[PDB]
């Protein structure tokens, strides 16, 4: 049958998996350091640190199985928006990938402990303690690597097994979420059994997504040298394959005996003393000195597909890309019937060929892969944008919340803050408008604070509120002046930031309590109450000058209910570089209102030049306490500053950098310098990349946690429906997200003054008309 | 398994590999000598020179194994052009090759020294010295044979050891690049494992690319009367075969004793086969003097294919083609298995029948005769173009980077200068355009100096500039001379070459003119106008103004700048049509053009193109800068290609003879005139190659291509149609012979139309205007006048 060939039986604890041969397993899901944004000394230092780690995690009680699974992305739920602009953008982006081969490649590392009644239970508990020590040391040496211990999807429904299903994805060919029952896992739990041909050419695998066929390659006689990332040319890899590097650790005297027999072979060659006995004696010296640790090893690449000519084509391309880098893959005959059963990490019996390798040549073969999202689908929301063009590589799946320095991981969901920095108008607002437009698939309510009349047409076409501020016109927000919790506290803050220990600090709290007790008795009084509050018990200055603050509650009604009608809200903080005269009270009560509003969804506070308005100590107290409370309770801050080396002088910017998850560096030219390496936590290669992309390349360095790569937008794509359609250029709905100020501002104002409700169906029609007039007559006629 | 049948062990030195029985191999690749160019009686002289070499290194430790491998060439890449006209020409030429005679054959020779603890190391260190001596001898003897000693290939990505890959090709069936590693080669070479069954079955070879089958033919006859090319009739056939000849040298007592045994059985005892007893006595005295060397020799023909009826058909067709040359093949039974392991050059065990033959009957059965075929890959650039219609169908794979007897040091990549010889432009311009398009395949920086408005449509459609430079139109000023880069020396040389024509060393006077000209820093047309309006204050500004003629339209001086894409292109062209000396017109404009285009690109693909190359290079400055420019530009990846209309007029000069001496690929087009003591003296042909060039004809564009020491005829043949395609609606080719051939009244009107009638940078105005050329000239042009 099939159940005798798969050795697992979960009977111990969360991370450890027992079996019938009394072995124990523990699976890690890693997404390692990117192999595109680092120097050669950095990857050499990484391999040296990993070898110094694995030198202690040794001594014959260990088997490490590194799996590199390149898999299609069937789990991605591309869905609808229920507004026509964002659905049009999703349609253009989804069919803007003309054969991009959307595959993601995750890593796994299986740690297997094998030692060689109540005493057997004691030995089992000793293996549990020993493997927990191994897992603790491995997690302490994988802090840069993003290695989540994979006993993490527990208690979903009725006790689902997370160190399982990866051991199903090897054996079934599809990620089936395994249930834990009081039974054995080898009975009939692994459902989709594969079958083999009688000659052993290509095996078949009857999954639920369709019948597949697979072929394998075994690596033998690899090169005597070892590049650190030597076999990373199989990550582009149009294969949907599974790579398995098994290293079962041999002890020191067993490895010394193996080199003794190898020297006996190389010295008793029939009159060919090939002078190769000078590096194996050096290897014996490194073994006795303790610099190495050797063990048995086999590498199997199982490439999947269908229509066996295509499987053989993939096998031939894999053999070509392997022999390019000086390893020799032999194909497999009927021993493939054992080789797939050598895929599982409890398979010393059906092991194809145990080549003894040193640990440096094992870490040099599986060091780790390029950059993707560690959770493509599975975030606290859905995946925001399937960003293409990690440059010559996989997709991105850009998320606002990925990871951070994982200390005290409990009592928090995930840090979600992002810093979308870049040079002034060099491709910042188009990316921010695109991300805020694409994020609407799981219903957030974004609140934006602009730089200078930017992102206007995007938020206005999304259905947003977007009041544009001018401070002279009476159309503006009014002081609401009715919280029945700490009206005295907000009267204190209003008095001190209206006079602008402010000036003398003499009994202003008595003025606040007097105006509260004389005016508010108790609830639901109108502009009579607001007029008493404005008049008597900005303040003295506008009271004696009559000019400069018309936009506040100066015979303006209580516009306080306007935070349940729309979803996107937008305020222009353009003419407010004169803080703390005007910018900090306005944003003080705006952030007061919009922080009293928390609707449970992702409240995305979008800032443009966040260091400009937040220049008061009240916003420092908010950037401590409110930032902790909002990044706790399903809130997301999206900053976009422009001059970060001019922003780094304030400590508010420092404490907002230190609590920010994902960074985007867009178009920083050579005018900026080595201060990206300190504060922003970069290496030298990442700053070299962001300075070497140039000025008008419109691609950005994305960095999440300890991973970094590049990303583009690719606004040139076309599709083929039956014959090859026209080139779309992604230029329809591109001037609406770029937000050129005069055309979009004038036409948006005039056609919200022409048709009443804010349209997604009628605003871009005449917006397209008024943009096409300029873009056709002004740019084609005169030459 | 198979690891006991394939006898190889580790590399011992750079070029010598080992065996599990302590034999030492060294693999040469022999780009063999071209035999269908001189095959009257010099073939016997080549065979006698090779036998006089092989008698020197007789050395009964030795065993030679030579392999003729016909391979269906797959490594020639598809040519992505990123153009429209040149891509159309590449598509038309690629569909022009349905001529099924692909399969380049390459010839290898493995020298196997078989030497019959620390003493074993001494044995190895003596066998290395002996095989290095034999390698030096065979290198000095195969100098004209295009030899290359296959070394350990020190950078593929780490180290890739490539005499081993050919040793893989005998056992695997494809060029598998075998990486050198910490394991003997007997355990990991045989990737594609063979299979054999029983009586009535040919061998199977289950490769990853597809299933293959193979049969074997064994040479077993008592034939003596051999010719030096008796088995090159298979060198044009289509089997994808591997033909192995093995010759292990018999020792002198064993050779004399077995020759005594065979002569007792043959030339004596009352039958004697009269009269075959005469050669044996003098040959026995020659063997006691060593003039013969007898050796165990066998030969197998492994014929590859698929669909075993087709393998049996190819075996029967090879049987007929070898029965044509009085050789009797035999099919191989179950000993095919052993016979397949008879191909690897360390197996004296699995040999079919080690019958002894002499050295001349081994060097005559398998000499290094080869149809000329260039490198498909491996050249430092991309391969240029394949051209068929050579000696018996096999393709050529033309390449500029072909070796020579020069390069005493291996400093540059490969010598790559080329020149065409032909009279009256008899289809020269079409060949130069057809080479320029397939050179535009791998993006070069072409600079051309055309003769009389030729190559103008090809350059203009290829993304070129093509200054007309003519003293006859209402326009014409295209020269600037304004910014100085090598100011004092080069503009001093240009001034003294512009004014110095009086019959007297005005060098310091011109130096003071340049010193008063440079006023002061970074000046424009104001500075050039100051240079024009400097006072006379003898050889003076008078002849300068009167030999620019005043309002210098055809001339170089008194111009504005023409700064428009002088460096941001890929193809530049100039004309020297109305340029002849007295007055000195052609030399300063050529000096200025070579000076400005010297430092165009230092490092990437550069190709100087010259038409009538002996015409501008006449003065002594051109000799000095030609020698220095060759010596410093051949290292900086700048190759040349010349073309002349007369051989004898080009051989009249001396610096032109120096440039002839340093070329690397000659293409002799067509000469019925054929002055005898110029082709064989200056351009270095033999007598039979010159007779070939004379008998080539006068209008057909069949040309003798000679590169290295190989020579073969070729025809580019852009006049051939086809018979089938996927879109079965049209199967004839007609175009692109009227755009590269570039008749000057067509090119003048194409330039006038691209200036005034339409206006376009790329080749997008072309095809209806090509109809406006062709159909309009055929209907209302030549035939119907008025």
Residue numbers in the entry:
A (entry chain A): 15 to 130, 146 to 529, 533 to 569, 584 to 829
B (entry chain B): 15 to 130, 146 to 532, 538 to 571, 581 to 829
Publication passage describing the model:
In Gram-negative bacteria, conjugation is mediated by a large transport apparatus—the conjugative type IV secretion system (T4SS)—produced by the donor cell and embedded in both its outer and inner membranes. The T4SS also elaborates a long extracellular filament—the conjugative pilus—that is essential for DNA transfer. Here we present a single-particle cryo-EM structure of a T4SS complex from the R388 plasmid that comprises all four sub-complexes: OMCC, stalk, arches and IMC. Three ATPases, VirB4 (also known as TrwK), VirB11 (also known as TrwD) and VirD4, power the system.
We first solved the structure of VirB4 in its unbound form (VirB4unbound) and fitted and rebuilt the structure within the IMC density. The dimer interface between VirB4central and VirB4outside is mediated entirely by the N-terminal domains of each subunit.
